[PDB]
Amino acid sequence: AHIEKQAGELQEKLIAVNRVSKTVKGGRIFSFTALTVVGDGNGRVGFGYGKAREVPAAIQKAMEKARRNMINVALNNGTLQHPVKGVHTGSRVFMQPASEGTGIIAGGAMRAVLEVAGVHNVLAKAYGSTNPINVVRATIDGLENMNSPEMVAAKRGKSVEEILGK
Amino acid sequence: QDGTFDKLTKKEALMRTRELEKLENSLGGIKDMGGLPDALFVIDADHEHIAIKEANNLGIPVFAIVDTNSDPDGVDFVIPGNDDAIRAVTLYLGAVAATVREGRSQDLASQAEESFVEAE
Amino acid sequence: PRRRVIGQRKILPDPKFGSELLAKFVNILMVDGKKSTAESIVYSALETLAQRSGKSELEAFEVALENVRPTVEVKSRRVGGSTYQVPVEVRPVRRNALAMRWIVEAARKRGDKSMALRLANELSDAAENKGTAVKKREDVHRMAEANKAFAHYRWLSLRSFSHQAGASSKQPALGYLN
Amino acid sequence: GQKVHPNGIRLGIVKPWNSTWFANTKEFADNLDSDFKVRQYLTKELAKASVSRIVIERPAKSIRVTIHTARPGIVIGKKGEDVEKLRKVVADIAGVPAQINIAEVRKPELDAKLVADSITSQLERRVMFRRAMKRAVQNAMRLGAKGIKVEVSGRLGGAEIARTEWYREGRVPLHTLRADIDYNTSEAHTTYGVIGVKVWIFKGEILGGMAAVEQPEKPAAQPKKQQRKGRK
RNA sequence: UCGCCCCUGAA
RNA sequence: CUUGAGUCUCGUAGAGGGGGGUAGAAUUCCAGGUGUAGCGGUGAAAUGCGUAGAGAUCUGGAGGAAUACCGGUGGCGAAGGCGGCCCCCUGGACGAAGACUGACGCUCAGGUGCGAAAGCGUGGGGAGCAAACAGGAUUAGAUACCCUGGUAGUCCACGCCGUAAACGAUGUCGACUUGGAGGUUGUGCCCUUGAGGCGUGGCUUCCGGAGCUAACGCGUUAAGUCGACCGCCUGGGGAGUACGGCCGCAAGGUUAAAACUCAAAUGAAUUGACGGGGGCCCGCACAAGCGGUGGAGCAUGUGGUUUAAUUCGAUGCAACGCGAAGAACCUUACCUGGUCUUGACAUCCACGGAAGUUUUCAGAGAUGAGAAUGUGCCUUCGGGAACCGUGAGACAGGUGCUGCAUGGCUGUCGUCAGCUCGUGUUGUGAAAUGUUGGGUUAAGUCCCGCAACGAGCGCAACCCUUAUCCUUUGUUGCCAGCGGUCCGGCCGGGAACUCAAAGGAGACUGCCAGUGAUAAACUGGAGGAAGGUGGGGAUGACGUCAAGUCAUCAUGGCCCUUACGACCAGGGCUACACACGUGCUACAAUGGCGCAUACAAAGAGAAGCGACCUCGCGAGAGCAAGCGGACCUCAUAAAGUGCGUCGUAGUCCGGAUUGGAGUCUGCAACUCGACUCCAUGAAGUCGGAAUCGCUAGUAAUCGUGGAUCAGAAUGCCACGGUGAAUACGU
């Protein structure tokens, strides 16, 4: 994709951070992996999974890859414009728009991912097994998938032209 | 040209000859490349459907012909021709080597015209 | 597991036969890696043979040994399809080795003074098959010709036979013997 | 054990010896002991300059105080007053008189011992452990070296586990016989235990230091081999 | 084809 | 009203269901014939069966059960399920024109019917197989798998029970949504001029798109996208059990809990690991060979045991001739006793004395107390500096304890061809790709291909050394051409030659042919001293084993403080009734002993080796040259060889044990030194079960030297001599 870490407006942030393992021929190795997001407070948000032998380069590489998995989002107000109740992976995702005068209200991944993405008055919820790692798939289920007033308005405008043409 | 002058023995110079010439055989064709491409015609989708993925994870436009197992993706201007170049090679001679090869004959004249407006 | 050809030994011609075959008969009669002490007995026993028998210098060994060597040696390997250990028809080179070895073994079953006199008299009785070193032959060759199930490993081999054209009886094995 | 440390001929005819001297039949023992003793006191009483490595050269009528540093400007100080004091230590222990000699000038991003003691002193101020080497390797690779491979023993945080902190960057083959393989060690002696340090800098890659720059002798290319004459 | 079991724990 | 549903008509195909007939093959029984000593079974066996005639083989007769092939993801049924052939009765499905009915439909708790196999009751039938059962076998045991028999049962009729991983682990019905290929069965069309070419329905596999799924995958016959109705689940174990009800003749089935107890149980997938899973490839891994050990004695270590101590640590291989490269005292940590306490060893502070030198006594010395003598370096002449003793503390010392606090070092798989990483892509992720595949090599080696592209470590690489030939330098080394001769490289001469050892030449699949994708490579060939990682070293990765080592050394914590520290004399380490590990020496004539005789290499050396000459049986001692050296000495190499003998005996083999007499090295050799001399003369006549090494200058065997060392090698380490067998083949 394209950069989401941009001078004078960058909004670096992290999500997960942990270690994972592979069982090698000898002993067992540890790969320092982590999820990140850089925002701008205006959308443009992504995610990356680094692999490293150290925690700093785990976040380095994950923010490289964050820019390579940027998704665009555009909105008005401090809240998302459309509810998306879609589910990606086995973590169940829900997402309402909500009037200003309320917080993010979420302790999971979607506390921080729903901050960087220019939203902070959104109300969201999740069901199913607790697992922050795929709460992050609310990139798919709300930011990537959306509707906007001028999208729906051009449905109503497309139809009129066809009747005239015949 | 210095592999027989920095290596002065058979146990070195002719060891280097073997290993080098059978790299340049096919890597030859990718060292004639210039800068980063802005266009990428394809003629296949058996092993050139790599293009329609990666150069649309980056958005460098892929110009793809009609396919028998796939749909073009990117900024596509379809042209007669199908996937598999083992059964459409002779066809490409006067199809896509006559619209995309001449896709440059036409472009050069238009490019000259555009430069003239800028100059004035 | 074994890569490329085996070694070959180039050895000297004898100073009384010119042979490398009967140089290999000094080699068998070496002990403690001394060819010096070996060569003694060899010639001492050559003479003993010449007196006690007719023969010739290339028949005092040669002919006598061609009555001690079997043409089949039975080796070992657990597989056989009956837990059998298979006959192996030996190459003419390995024929030599067997008989040569056994004649020296036979002189350690004797106590008839020296070592020359031992193997000499033994070789004199070994050309008419009335020795005790020719009776070693009569167990290797007796076995082999009275019992066979060949080099096939019967269960494994049978599957291979069946696939090729349809058989259960002996033929070359197309499939694995693994 | 896990690493057997191959360096026994990498400093042979592949790179120079670090204590070149000669001794005769009953002098072997003496010359050995005397040299090593001096070096202990020497290296300890100097710490105001960044020691590349002490070396000595003993003509066996003098010994040469040939300390090398990356900062000779602190070694000299004012006048000769500094170096004088140090020279005396040598003269005392070793049975010969002694003479002051050169200390190297060049960037401190060279020599394994230069990079060793620097980060070791850092650990003894109880700052950096993992991170120690990393800074010193971005340095070392920036200018100088042709690959570095550091080893450091993990003991950090008051944790009581035996660990190995192993970081390389650039190429270090350990078996190249046509390259200047550097190798020195340091050790911290913190309250977290003992932290061994090993710095292996692959300074050369195709050029030796004693496989290059030497003079052999013979083939003199003369068809006559001179003989005494006269007849009697 | 030649049966054939049994094995306290955190690096 | 007809699109849903249903009927009518005409055909179509099929192991649909039920009933009754019928054929042959095979096994078995019975009968007869032929023929004789085995049969049968198994990995081997045994039980069993045979001369009273089996097995096999042939002929006749009889019976029971099942129908080889056919035969296929082929077909049919609601499901369960259903196979030789024929008849009868009978059900379902589908298609084709039309024709008709006119939502009559869909689903369904209850209810009702159908139920593989086993089981149960009743009556028939009984060949084979087979629970049970009985021998045999395998196994430590084997109430089993395995073998030989064999009963209920399986089979038929009728009734009953109603379960099954009753499966597509997928409720049924209706509706939709890319396609491709095959199978099967109707029917329309096309010079049907092609068994078929093009359609269109029904059913059935495989593939796969979108989508869905956590993934595997499902994928128009859905796990996709919808609706309708019903059934079920709501953590696991407890338990499909208890309790009650229901059903059954019963066996049991059916409905169906709770107490209690646990923080998981569980599904899918990832990488490695393992498999008596498979495929592939190597190594003395095996086969084929050669040589040992375990037997015996001695040497050496260890365990056990004992002792005041037998100082400590190591624990298959990778501990146990290891740390320890020689333990008389010391060493030495251990014991017993003597003895000291800021100290034997350090710094600093204070005092005196410079340290010392030669001697005395007591004592086992450690020491303790003296007797004389010394006044260097500087000085202000006191004092200090080195240094010594004593005092005092802060301290010092500790091979004291933790290798589960650690460093450093090392072993280990393994000289293994593997091991990773960056970047991109793929996957929600763990991760994957690469690194896999097709060839090939010793090699992640090289080539080709393939979402991989690059790179690092390891292999290889470059380094040494050796196999040749050349170059220098020729003394203490060489001696041809040249002379002496003393005939000896001993002297001159000659540097040619060997030799030394520094530097080069050389080998790279380089070249030739074939083979191999024309690729790498492989097989022969040539040239050469040598071909195909030439041979041997160094080279031993990143790691794993909380492997070892606080006792080489270092060090976090801990402990001892007129001591656990320190020093000394004696003793213990070499006890000992034994066991184990690693070696060495024999058991002999290819040898022993006696004579004479052949040639070595590489190291060592003024606490040293020591020629010569003298003496000693000897070990060795005296006398003494030489040597820090291609000088001289250790050094006489030994097996070997030519002769003398002995004759297969426990001996002319073998050498243990002990005594006496001597030697040497040391202050002194008593436990606890080695060598020699003479005597005594051992066990053993060549070693089970078992187990180990080795593919060539190796094995084997024979000596020699070195370190450690005042003085102790059957050990370790190194050097040469002579010098194989065997390898089809994995």
Tab-separated table of N, CA, C and O (backbone and C1' of nucleotides) in Angstrom, chain F residues 545-590:
chain	number	residue	atom	x	y	z
F	545	C	P	19.195	-27.483	26.553
F	545	C	O5'	19.841	-28.879	26.812
F	545	C	C5'	19.151	-30.098	27.022
F	545	C	C4'	20.195	-31.193	27.294
F	545	C	C3'	21.072	-31.033	28.548
F	545	C	O3'	20.417	-31.577	29.687
F	545	C	C1'	22.454	-31.513	26.692
F	546	A	P	19.529	-30.781	30.715
F	546	A	O5'	20.178	-29.343	30.787
F	546	A	C5'	19.348	-28.204	31.032
F	546	A	C4'	20.183	-27.097	31.686
F	546	A	C3'	21.307	-27.561	32.620
F	546	A	O3'	22.457	-27.962	31.876
F	546	A	C1'	20.082	-25.930	33.724
F	547	A	P	23.481	-28.955	32.565
F	547	A	O5'	23.349	-30.197	31.607
F	547	A	C5'	23.170	-31.542	32.060
F	547	A	C4'	24.469	-32.353	32.009
F	547	A	C3'	25.731	-31.823	32.695
F	547	A	O3'	25.691	-32.161	34.079
F	547	A	C1'	26.298	-32.405	30.513
F	548	G	P	26.224	-31.187	35.203
F	548	G	O5'	27.779	-31.426	35.074
F	548	G	C5'	28.299	-32.746	35.287
F	548	G	C4'	29.793	-32.768	34.967
F	548	G	C3'	30.624	-31.675	35.631
F	548	G	O3'	30.964	-32.110	36.953
F	548	G	C1'	31.125	-31.691	33.355
F	549	U	P	30.908	-31.083	38.147
F	549	U	O5'	32.218	-30.259	37.899
F	549	U	C5'	33.503	-30.854	38.065
F	549	U	C4'	34.574	-29.924	37.499
F	549	U	C3'	34.542	-28.543	38.138
F	549	U	O3'	35.305	-28.598	39.343
F	549	U	C1'	34.580	-28.316	35.785
F	550	C	P	34.630	-28.207	40.722
F	550	C	O5'	35.203	-26.762	40.998
F	550	C	C5'	34.384	-25.619	40.781
F	550	C	C4'	35.145	-24.392	41.275
F	550	C	C3'	35.273	-24.421	42.805
F	550	C	O3'	36.506	-23.829	43.246
F	550	C	C1'	33.758	-22.719	42.195
F	551	A	P	37.274	-24.482	44.477
F	551	A	O5'	38.368	-25.424	43.839
F	551	A	C5'	39.414	-24.901	43.018
F	551	A	C4'	39.796	-25.856	41.875
F	551	A	C3'	38.633	-26.509	41.103
F	551	A	O3'	38.832	-26.525	39.686
F	551	A	C1'	39.805	-28.174	42.330
F	552	U	P	39.971	-27.145	38.789
F	552	U	O5'	41.172	-26.159	39.047
F	552	U	C5'	42.478	-26.670	39.336
F	552	U	C4'	43.522	-25.739	38.737
F	552	U	C3'	43.316	-24.248	38.978
F	552	U	O3'	43.733	-23.919	40.303
F	552	U	C1'	43.865	-24.601	36.724
F	553	C	P	43.042	-22.728	41.088
F	553	C	O5'	42.894	-21.558	40.050
F	553	C	C5'	43.973	-20.707	39.685
F	553	C	C4'	43.510	-19.744	38.586
F	553	C	C3'	42.332	-18.842	38.963
F	553	C	O3'	42.843	-17.707	39.677
F	553	C	C1'	41.851	-19.870	36.903
F	554	A	P	41.956	-17.042	40.814
F	554	A	O5'	40.719	-16.408	40.052
F	554	A	C5'	41.007	-15.383	39.086
F	554	A	C4'	39.718	-14.930	38.410
F	554	A	C3'	38.516	-14.677	39.320
F	554	A	O3'	38.649	-13.395	39.928
F	554	A	C1'	37.830	-15.941	37.476
F	555	U	P	38.238	-13.116	41.428
F	555	U	O5'	36.666	-12.980	41.443
F	555	U	C5'	35.954	-12.065	40.610
F	555	U	C4'	34.515	-12.565	40.408
F	555	U	C3'	33.741	-12.909	41.691
F	555	U	O3'	33.169	-11.701	42.207
F	555	U	C1'	33.621	-14.748	40.226
F	556	G	P	32.194	-11.704	43.455
F	556	G	O5'	30.789	-11.892	42.780
F	556	G	C5'	29.872	-10.859	42.437
F	556	G	C4'	28.451	-11.306	42.806
F	556	G	C3'	28.299	-11.763	44.266
F	556	G	O3'	28.126	-10.632	45.129
F	556	G	C1'	27.382	-13.395	42.896
F	557	G	P	28.560	-10.791	46.656
F	557	G	O5'	27.559	-11.798	47.355
F	557	G	C5'	26.153	-11.545	47.425
F	557	G	C4'	25.400	-12.827	47.805
F	557	G	C3'	25.878	-13.542	49.074
F	557	G	O3'	25.320	-12.908	50.236
F	557	G	C1'	25.722	-15.117	47.372
F	558	C	P	26.178	-12.928	51.577
F	558	C	O5'	26.190	-14.441	52.020
F	558	C	C5'	24.977	-15.160	52.261
F	558	C	C4'	25.313	-16.620	52.566
F	558	C	C3'	26.400	-16.862	53.617
F	558	C	O3'	25.821	-16.721	54.909
F	558	C	C1'	26.862	-18.181	51.763
F	559	C	P	26.604	-16.051	56.101
F	559	C	O5'	27.621	-17.174	56.549
F	559	C	C5'	27.116	-18.377	57.147
F	559	C	C4'	28.210	-19.449	57.186
F	559	C	C3'	29.474	-18.999	57.925
F	559	C	O3'	29.309	-19.204	59.333
F	559	C	C1'	30.106	-19.906	55.871
F	560	C	P	30.159	-18.301	60.324
F	560	C	O5'	31.563	-19.001	60.302
F	560	C	C5'	31.768	-20.306	60.834
F	560	C	C4'	33.257	-20.632	60.738
F	560	C	C3'	34.211	-19.572	61.289
F	560	C	O3'	34.297	-19.742	62.704
F	560	C	C1'	34.950	-20.211	59.166
F	561	U	P	34.242	-18.496	63.675
F	561	U	O5'	35.600	-17.733	63.440
F	561	U	C5'	36.834	-18.448	63.502
F	561	U	C4'	38.014	-17.480	63.450
F	561	U	C3'	37.924	-16.315	64.452
F	561	U	O3'	39.208	-16.092	65.062
F	561	U	C1'	37.921	-15.448	62.261
F	562	U	P	39.597	-17.048	66.276
F	562	U	O5'	40.784	-16.250	66.954
F	562	U	C5'	42.126	-16.448	66.471
F	562	U	C4'	43.000	-17.098	67.550
F	562	U	C3'	42.488	-18.370	68.212
F	562	U	O3'	42.673	-19.479	67.325
F	562	U	C1'	43.391	-16.938	69.843
F	563	A	P	41.888	-20.804	67.693
F	563	A	O5'	42.009	-21.616	66.345
F	563	A	C5'	41.199	-22.784	66.147
F	563	A	C4'	40.068	-22.545	65.122
F	563	A	C3'	40.339	-23.171	63.758
F	563	A	O3'	39.927	-24.535	63.811
F	563	A	C1'	39.703	-20.941	63.435
F	564	C	P	40.566	-25.636	62.889
F	564	C	O5'	39.627	-25.535	61.623
F	564	C	C5'	39.778	-26.512	60.585
F	564	C	C4'	39.186	-25.970	59.283
F	564	C	C3'	39.541	-24.486	58.989
F	564	C	O3'	40.031	-24.261	57.674
F	564	C	C1'	37.252	-24.785	58.775
F	565	G	P	41.218	-25.053	57.007
F	565	G	O5'	42.084	-23.896	56.383
F	565	G	C5'	41.484	-22.837	55.631
F	565	G	C4'	42.112	-21.504	56.041
F	565	G	C3'	43.623	-21.502	56.261
F	565	G	O3'	44.253	-21.420	54.980
F	565	G	C1'	42.648	-20.443	58.074
F	566	A	P	45.249	-22.568	54.548
F	566	A	O5'	46.579	-22.182	55.301
F	566	A	C5'	47.025	-20.821	55.355
F	566	A	C4'	48.077	-20.679	56.444
F	566	A	C3'	49.087	-21.809	56.549
F	566	A	O3'	50.064	-21.626	55.524
F	566	A	C1'	48.350	-21.181	58.699
F	567	C	P	50.666	-22.866	54.760
F	567	C	O5'	51.701	-23.407	55.824
F	567	C	C5'	52.904	-22.662	56.039
F	567	C	C4'	53.647	-23.220	57.253
F	567	C	C3'	53.995	-24.715	57.254
F	567	C	O3'	55.162	-24.932	56.455
F	567	C	C1'	53.070	-24.139	59.336
F	568	C	P	55.463	-26.360	55.821
F	568	C	O5'	55.849	-27.246	57.077
F	568	C	C5'	57.092	-26.987	57.744
F	568	C	C4'	57.236	-27.909	58.957
F	568	C	C3'	57.066	-29.423	58.809
F	568	C	O3'	58.290	-29.984	58.319
F	568	C	C1'	55.785	-28.707	60.626
F	569	A	P	58.298	-31.367	57.547
F	569	A	O5'	58.326	-32.479	58.670
F	569	A	C5'	59.383	-32.518	59.635
F	569	A	C4'	59.007	-33.452	60.790
F	569	A	C3'	58.589	-34.874	60.396
F	569	A	O3'	59.766	-35.669	60.239
F	569	A	C1'	56.988	-33.978	61.861
F	570	G	P	59.776	-36.942	59.300
F	570	G	O5'	59.123	-38.090	60.188
F	570	G	C5'	58.260	-39.041	59.539
F	570	G	C4'	57.177	-39.553	60.487
F	570	G	C3'	56.069	-40.316	59.775
F	570	G	O3'	56.506	-41.633	59.424
F	570	G	C1'	55.090	-38.809	61.234
F	571	G	P	56.244	-42.119	57.934
F	571	G	O5'	54.707	-42.498	57.929
F	571	G	C5'	54.242	-43.459	58.881
F	571	G	C4'	52.716	-43.481	58.917
F	571	G	C3'	51.994	-43.683	57.585
F	571	G	O3'	52.007	-45.078	57.270
F	571	G	C1'	50.993	-41.898	58.737
F	572	G	P	51.771	-45.574	55.786
F	572	G	O5'	50.383	-44.935	55.359
F	572	G	C5'	49.192	-45.663	55.699
F	572	G	C4'	47.945	-44.876	55.286
F	572	G	C3'	47.745	-44.647	53.794
F	572	G	O3'	47.224	-45.831	53.170
F	572	G	C1'	47.357	-42.643	54.899
F	573	C	P	47.840	-46.237	51.763
F	573	C	O5'	47.497	-44.978	50.863
F	573	C	C5'	46.120	-44.722	50.544
F	573	C	C4'	46.015	-43.641	49.464
F	573	C	C3'	46.349	-44.083	48.054
F	573	C	O3'	45.290	-44.886	47.528
F	573	C	C1'	47.311	-41.981	48.449
F	574	U	P	45.453	-45.600	46.120
F	574	U	O5'	46.953	-46.121	46.073
F	574	U	C5'	47.473	-46.940	47.131
F	574	U	C4'	48.188	-48.158	46.552
F	574	U	C3'	48.758	-48.997	47.709
F	574	U	O3'	48.736	-50.405	47.456
F	574	U	C1'	50.517	-48.231	46.402
F	575	A	P	47.425	-51.272	47.585
F	575	A	O5'	46.934	-50.940	49.051
F	575	A	C5'	46.407	-51.974	49.886
F	575	A	C4'	46.728	-51.687	51.348
F	575	A	C3'	46.036	-52.728	52.210
F	575	A	O3'	46.786	-53.051	53.396
F	575	A	C1'	44.895	-50.630	52.419
F	576	C	P	46.909	-54.603	53.762
F	576	C	O5'	45.446	-55.136	53.450
F	576	C	C5'	45.226	-56.117	52.429
F	576	C	C4'	43.727	-56.405	52.273
F	576	C	C3'	43.348	-57.172	50.998
F	576	C	O3'	43.711	-58.545	51.068
F	576	C	C1'	41.857	-55.373	51.325
F	577	A	P	43.367	-59.753	52.022
F	577	A	O5'	41.958	-60.265	51.490
F	577	A	C5'	41.736	-61.689	51.536
F	577	A	C4'	40.264	-62.034	51.293
F	577	A	C3'	39.662	-61.658	49.934
F	577	A	O3'	39.985	-62.661	48.976
F	577	A	C1'	38.216	-60.965	51.627
F	578	C	P	40.348	-62.341	47.474
F	578	C	O5'	38.999	-62.655	46.700
F	578	C	C5'	38.561	-61.806	45.630
F	578	C	C4'	37.129	-61.315	45.819
F	578	C	C3'	36.682	-60.518	44.596
F	578	C	O3'	36.122	-61.429	43.653
F	578	C	C1'	36.344	-59.218	46.531
F	579	A	P	36.469	-61.421	42.116
F	579	A	O5'	35.486	-60.372	41.475
F	579	A	C5'	34.082	-60.650	41.435
F	579	A	C4'	33.315	-59.356	41.151
F	579	A	C3'	33.836	-58.593	39.923
F	579	A	O3'	33.214	-59.128	38.753
F	579	A	C1'	33.733	-57.107	41.711
F	580	C	P	34.020	-59.287	37.400
F	580	C	O5'	33.906	-57.860	36.743
F	580	C	C5'	32.633	-57.314	36.383
F	580	C	C4'	32.768	-55.799	36.210
F	580	C	C3'	33.848	-55.327	35.238
F	580	C	O3'	33.364	-55.448	33.895
F	580	C	C1'	34.044	-54.095	37.211
F	581	G	P	34.435	-55.621	32.735
F	581	G	O5'	34.997	-54.166	32.507
F	581	G	C5'	34.108	-53.099	32.162
F	581	G	C4'	34.885	-51.788	32.070
F	581	G	C3'	36.136	-51.861	31.184
F	581	G	O3'	35.775	-51.621	29.809
F	581	G	C1'	36.727	-50.950	33.268
F	582	U	P	36.759	-52.212	28.703
F	582	U	O5'	38.114	-51.435	28.897
F	582	U	C5'	38.220	-50.049	28.581
F	582	U	C4'	39.668	-49.587	28.768
F	582	U	C3'	40.792	-50.401	28.106
F	582	U	O3'	40.924	-50.008	26.739
F	582	U	C1'	41.347	-50.058	30.362
F	583	G	P	41.801	-50.852	25.717
F	583	G	O5'	43.259	-50.741	26.310
F	583	G	C5'	44.283	-51.701	26.034
F	583	G	C4'	45.449	-51.482	27.009
F	583	G	C3'	46.604	-52.477	26.999
F	583	G	O3'	47.516	-52.142	25.954
F	583	G	C1'	45.951	-52.148	29.222
F	584	C	P	48.053	-53.209	24.926
F	584	C	O5'	49.112	-53.981	25.815
F	584	C	C5'	50.303	-53.275	26.201
F	584	C	C4'	51.032	-54.028	27.317
F	584	C	C3'	51.417	-55.473	26.992
F	584	C	O3'	52.667	-55.469	26.287
F	584	C	C1'	50.315	-55.444	29.057
F	585	U	P	53.089	-56.761	25.472
F	585	U	O5'	53.205	-57.890	26.558
F	585	U	C5'	54.303	-58.011	27.460
F	585	U	C4'	54.251	-59.393	28.114
F	585	U	C3'	53.985	-60.549	27.149
F	585	U	O3'	55.215	-60.881	26.501
F	585	U	C1'	52.584	-60.773	29.022
F	586	A	P	55.214	-61.917	25.307
F	586	A	O5'	55.109	-63.299	26.060
F	586	A	C5'	54.440	-64.384	25.415
F	586	A	C4'	54.112	-65.450	26.452
F	586	A	C3'	53.327	-66.609	25.852
F	586	A	O3'	54.253	-67.561	25.320
F	586	A	C1'	52.209	-65.812	27.762
F	587	C	P	54.075	-68.180	23.876
F	587	C	O5'	53.233	-69.491	24.097
F	587	C	C5'	53.607	-70.504	25.032
F	587	C	C4'	52.339	-71.119	25.617
F	587	C	C3'	51.305	-71.732	24.670
F	587	C	O3'	51.621	-73.103	24.433
F	587	C	C1'	50.220	-70.286	26.226
F	588	A	P	51.236	-73.861	23.106
F	588	A	O5'	52.333	-73.418	22.057
F	588	A	C5'	52.098	-72.368	21.108
F	588	A	C4'	53.374	-71.555	20.803
F	588	A	C3'	54.292	-72.067	19.690
F	588	A	O3'	53.811	-71.574	18.438
F	588	A	C1'	55.598	-71.505	21.599
F	589	A	P	53.867	-72.418	17.107
F	589	A	O5'	55.421	-72.632	16.906
F	589	A	C5'	55.855	-73.470	15.824
F	589	A	C4'	57.272	-73.064	15.409
F	589	A	C3'	57.865	-74.044	14.400
F	589	A	O3'	58.748	-73.399	13.473
F	589	A	C1'	59.083	-74.189	16.409
F	590	U	P	58.406	-73.169	11.945
F	590	U	O5'	57.993	-71.633	11.888
F	590	U	C5'	59.022	-70.707	11.487
F	590	U	C4'	58.526	-69.253	11.497
F	590	U	C3'	58.045	-68.763	12.870
F	590	U	O3'	58.500	-67.421	13.150
F	590	U	C1'	56.313	-68.497	11.336
